[PDB]
Design a binder for these strands. Structure first.
Lengths: 119, 50, 121, 153, 203, 149
RNA sequence: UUGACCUCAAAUCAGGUAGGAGUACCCGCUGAACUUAAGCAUAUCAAUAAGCGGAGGAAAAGAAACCAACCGGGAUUGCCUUAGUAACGGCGAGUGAAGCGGCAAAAGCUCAAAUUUGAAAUCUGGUACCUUCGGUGCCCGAGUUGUAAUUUGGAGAGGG
RNA sequence: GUUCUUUGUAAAGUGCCUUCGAAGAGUCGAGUUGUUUGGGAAUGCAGCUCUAAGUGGGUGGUAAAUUCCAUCUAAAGCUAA
């Protein structure tokens, strides 16, 4: 069988924690029956169900802390867009598009004109 | 020896587990070319150098 | 006015006020759960024929335990997973790289009667 | 400590050596009594701070474009001129009437020519003790130069 | 403008007023560390014409280096080669001492960028230099597009690659026939004229 | 080593020349790249003539002084004589060289006439965005060629 | 006594940054010998290999303290050519460019040096809010030992 | 292609007359030493010593003095193909 990720996201924080304990209890019993039977493929379903609950549990707490740091500077570093080491050190679009006040007048007064040569 | 660090014994445990023959069901797999364990080690035939 | 009276010829760094850390963001913002809980301390019982005879004779439970667990956590997990009293815990590292724990119960409990509740016998 | 010893012997090393006449025209600074009236007269011409400049603009944003004024709603300023670049230019253009020079400028070469420039240009000058006190009347930390161009009657 | 008066005064280095300050300052700089932070530039007019500005992010360091030639290591003087390479005591270290001063500062403050440097004082054993450093991570330099070019990563350790004023002087990068060997790069020019160019249709 | 009469050859192959052999296998490959680069550029620089107008220039060095050659820029005194400013001229496709002068009347009047014929053959589009498109001519040199006097 | 200033420190202070790897190509330092000269020491191999430091998708160079001696060219780079030439060298062995010319590609620029002086007009940070690669308000600070605006020699500025 | 906002008694360009016109120092340069270069009475670089000028200075491939001319504007910086 196995649990479904979409069925777990509709549960509260305590329901997921209580379900994780039951899956851990269920895994313990199968590890006792495993040593007395030639094969036990059922143990894979229980182990991957635990990974599903732990993923949803970690996703809910990460989403909750992402909302209390929302719309403010200095968000924690694992909730930040890594994307590269070097690209993080690169200038932002605002900083890279900065021009001095003197050259701003030259671009306004003398733009690159559009023209063609036939007549 | 007989009074060894944990790091030495950890490599001892790994070398003991790899000292096994091939499982018999591996030879029956489709497109299999492995015939015998070519990385077999024996304490009398060759030393593992820690 | 005069200056300070110094009774020693040695000048040493003054004790300045140390400020406690007040970070503007958490270091990880999600605390990791218990790395080694009761279900990770005890993995599976060891059911070799020599280990089984120690259960009904010496009232000693033989378990395979995590290599990161000490005698404190093994004792705490045994009395929480099975609700028994522990007299002493003896541990060894097996030659295959796994930890083996000899858990002896008190005289108020029977190891054979609770190994049946656990399963294996 | 080393920083305490290096600043005491620096004063020591600077008095055992023969100081050239360009330097040591400092430390003949204005006396304690005379400097009192100098800072009493200069304190009446403090420049506007960041505080009282703001409500000056508010009254100038409601009278010029509204009362059909030519930006003359505020009176002509009377403030002490400060800054090495500004005052040196005022000396060359015969605009300063009294120049105050600090004696404790650490890069002393900034103000060594000021007594010579004031003398040849004929403007009176006074080497005053304390670049920090000069900064107080211009609402800065250090000014090291203080000049007066005009004065009320 | 007072900067004209200091500029003319700094050229009278053997006058009595400058040589007294030279002897006082050479003592003070020697009591401090080899590399130490300078609160303000000793020569404000010299620094500000080299790119220094008086705002947050511009850092001035004072550094002294040992004068003289460069002794080849060659333990006990033996070189094990032709007699033309047996010289040990008259090698001249093709990089200037001012470039060595910049490189020592750039390793201590690795978070900064070396802009320029200038001579401040010297003695028999030590030559003293002041190096102008900028902060590429400060918002005043990240903005203010007159200075944000230093933040783009091609300018990492300019003094270590000879990209500073003293670095290009040591590399000889100028214009004219006198710099034919070194005008686009010594190793690139040599590789250009030591390359056998062969086409599909042989010429 | 020296025998069997032959001209004395000077072959400079006594270094590790085999490490610096450059065979131009990409002569056909890079030629396609230049045409591709020229094609993708012209679409980005919509219908500008892909190159600036350049003046007529007499070469130095009497081996070559008898010829005229396309120069760099239109020699600031010449730009004012044509009736426009240098900063405006750079935006219309007139390359400007500030560091060369005029000491030849024949060259000067040929370059001034070159600029007059250019302004009479352009369609400067307004900044508004009306865009009465004037489908591209890919060369400004093939329209105003350099001719020997 | 109290409050500044200057210099120098301390803190698990608030927020950042540097290391290492890779290293074909690039920017520098350092630097041989085998070999060739039928020996060999200058020379040659070679301003190379090895060693070390520092970058990028290219790097470097780059808008003349240039080439020229002309009826003058006009940033840099690369290719063809100049040319195995001028020249260098027990003038032995060998080494060895550059200007012009044709082409590829083309793009120009700004700081210091000025009194804004009838108004530091400049900027970081903190905080609050908002349309959040930022913006606005407020509050400390930086800064007159000079931050903005104007000007860069092709000019340009004060003025009329 | 459409659409919302007017920036602004703001900024920029050109004509004539008048007064000015600030422009980089242990740097240029020189001696010597080493290294390097095709650069040869010394091409570049570096150490040491000496140390500038303002109708000035650098360069003009033979060292020096004298008299002209030509040509650029160093000792600060950025930039695609």
């Amino acid at each position: 069988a196995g649990v479904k990720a979409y069925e777990l996201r509709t549960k509260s924080k305590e329901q997921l924690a209580s379900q994780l304990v039951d899956l851990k209890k269920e895994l313990a019993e199968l590890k006792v029956q495993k040593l007395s039977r030639p094969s036990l493929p059922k143990i894979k379903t229980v182990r991957k169900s635990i990974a599903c609950v732990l993923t949803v549990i970690n996703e809910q707490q990460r989403e909750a802390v992402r909302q209390l740091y929302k719309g403010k500077k200095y968000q924690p570093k694992d909730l930040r867009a890594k994307k590269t080491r070097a690209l993080r050190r690169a200038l932002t679009k605002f900083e890279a598009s900065q021009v001095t006040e003197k050259q701003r007048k030259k671009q306004i007064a003398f733009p690159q004109r559009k023209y063609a040569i036939k007549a | 020896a007989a009074q060894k660090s944990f790091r030495i014994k950890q490599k001892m445990a790994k070398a003991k587990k790899q000292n096994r023959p091939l499982p018999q069901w591996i030879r029956l797999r489709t497109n299999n070319t492995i015939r015998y364990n070519a990385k077999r080690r024996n304490w009398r035939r060759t030393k593992m150098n820690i | 006015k005069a200056l300070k009276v110094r009774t020693s010829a040695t000048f040493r760094l003054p004790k300045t006020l140390k400020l406690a850390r007040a970070p503007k963001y958490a270091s990880k913002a999600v605390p990791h759960y218990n790395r080694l809980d009761s279900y990770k301390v005890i993995e599976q019982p060891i059911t070799s024929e020599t280990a089984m005879k120690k259960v009904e004779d010496g009232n000693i439970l033989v378990f395979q335990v995590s290599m990161k667990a000490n005698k404190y956590q093994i004792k705490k997990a045994v009395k929480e997973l099975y609700e028994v009293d522990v007299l002493k815990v003896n541990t060894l590292v097996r030659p295959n790289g796994t930890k083996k724990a000899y858990v002896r119960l008190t005289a108020d409990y029977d190891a054979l009667d609770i190994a049946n509740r656990i399963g294996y016998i | 400590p080393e920083y305490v010893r290096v600043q005491r012997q620096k004063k020591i090393l600077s008095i055992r050596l023969k100081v050239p006449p360009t330097i040591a025209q400092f430390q003949y600074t204005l006396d304690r009594n005379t400097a009192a009236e100098t800072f009493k007269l200069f304190n009446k011409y403090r420049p506007e701070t960041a505080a009282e400049k703001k409500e000056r603009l508010t009254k100038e944003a409601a009278a010029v474009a509204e009362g059909k004024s030519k930006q003359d709603a505020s009176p002509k300023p009377y403030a002490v001129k400060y800054g090495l670049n500004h005052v040196v230019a005022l000396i060359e253009n015969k605009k300063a009437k009294l120049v105050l020079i600090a004696n404790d400028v650490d890069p002393i070469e900034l103000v060594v020519f000021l007594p010579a420039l004031c003398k040849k240009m004929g403007v009176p000058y006074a080497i005053v003790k304390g670049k920090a006190r000069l900064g107080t009347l211009v609402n800065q930390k250090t000014s090291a130069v203080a000049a007066l161009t005009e004065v009320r009657a | 403008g007072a900067y004209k008066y200091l500029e003319e005064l700094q050229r009278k280095k053997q006058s009595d007023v400058l040589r007294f300050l030279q002897r006082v300052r050479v003592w003070e700089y020697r009591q401090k560390n080899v590399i130490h932070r300078a609160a303000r530039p000793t020569r404000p007019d010299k620094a500000r014409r080299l790119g220094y500005k008086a705002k947050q992010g511009f850092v001035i360091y004072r550094v002294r280096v040992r004068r003289g030639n460069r002794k080849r290591p060659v333990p006990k003087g033996a070189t094990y080669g032709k007699p033309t390479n047996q010289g040990v005591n008259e090698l001249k270290y093709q990089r200037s001492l001012r470039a060595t001063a910049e490189e020592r500062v750039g390793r201590r403050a690795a978070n900064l960028r070396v802009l320029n440097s200038y001579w401040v004082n010297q003695d028999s054993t030590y030559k003293y230099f002041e190096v102008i450093l900028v902060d590429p991570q400060h918002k005043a330099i990240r903005r203010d597009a007159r200075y944000n070019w230093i933040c783009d990563p091609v300018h990492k350790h300019r003094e270590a690659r000879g990209l500073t004023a003293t670095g290009k002087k040591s590399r000889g990068i100028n214009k004219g026939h006198k710099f034919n060997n070194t005008k686009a790069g010594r190793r690139k020019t040599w590789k250009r004229q030591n390359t056998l160019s062969l086409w599909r249709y042989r010429k | 080593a020296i025998s069997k009469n032959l001209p004395i050859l000077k072959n400079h192959f006594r270094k590790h020349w085999q490490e610096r052999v450059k065979v131009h296998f990409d002569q056909a490959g890079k030629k396609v790249s230049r045409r591709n680069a020229r094609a993708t550029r012209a679409a980005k620089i919509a219908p500008r003539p892909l190159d600036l107008l350049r003046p007529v220039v007499r070469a130095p060095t009497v081996k070559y002084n008898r010829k005229v050659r396309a120069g760099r820029g239109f020699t600031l005194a010449e730009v004012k004589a044509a009736g426009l400013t240098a900063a405006y001229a750079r935006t219309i496709g007139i390359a400007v060289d500030h560091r060369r002068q005029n000491r030849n009347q024949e060259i000067f009047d040929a370059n001034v006439q070159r600029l007059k014929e250019y302004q009479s053959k352009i369609i400067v589009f307004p900044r508004n965005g009306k865009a009465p498109e004037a489908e591209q001519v890919l060369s400004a040199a093939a329209t105003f060629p350099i001719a020997q006097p």
